[PDB]
Paper text:
Depending on the ligand size/conformation, the noncovalent contacts varied in their type and multiplicity. The [name]–sclx4 complex [Fig. 2(a)] was similar to cytochrome c–sclx4, involving a salt bridge and CH—π/cation—π bonds with the encapsulated lysine. In total, the protein–sclx4 interfaces buried ∼660 Å2 of protein.
[name] is a small (∼6.2 kDa, 55 residues) lysine-rich protein (13 × Lys, pI ≃ 9) and a potent agent against Aspergillus species and dermatophytes. The NMR structure is a twisted β-barrel composed of five antiparallel β-strands and stabilized by three disulfide bridges. Despite the varying size and conformational flexibility, sclx4, sclx6 and sclx8 bound similarly the Pro29-Lys30-Phe31 motif in loop 3.
Residue numbers in the entry: 1 to 55
Amino acid sequence: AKYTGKCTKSKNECKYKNDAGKDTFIKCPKFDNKKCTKDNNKCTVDTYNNAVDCD
Ligand SMILES: O=S(=O)(O)c1cc2c(O)c(c1)Cc1cc(S(=O)(=O)O)cc(c1O)Cc1cc(S(=O)(=O)O)cc(c1O)Cc1cc(S(=O)(=O)O)cc(c1O)C2
């Protein structure tokens, strides 16, 4: 499943709702182009390949 969520800057985490609707918090990468740069920025998660991209 491909989901869109919101990331937090200080924890560099992506918050999204999983298959069941549960809030799920996962770590964005540190790499600049995939890290969270501002609270409530968009992030996406693909639950099959674990592609996590935070803005
Ligand atoms: O995110 S962490 O705080 O847990 C962390 C800190 C450091 C680390 O070396 C790593 C994680 C491992 C690591 C993870 C990733 S990731 O796969 O994307 O999550 C990437 C890197 C890495 O070392 C590569 C990397 C990227 C960047 S950046 O894209 O320009 O932000 C910078 C660095 C990298 O090694 C240098 C770096 C900076 C810093 S700093 O404190 O932010 O200056 C701490 C650590 C560093 O290795 C020290």
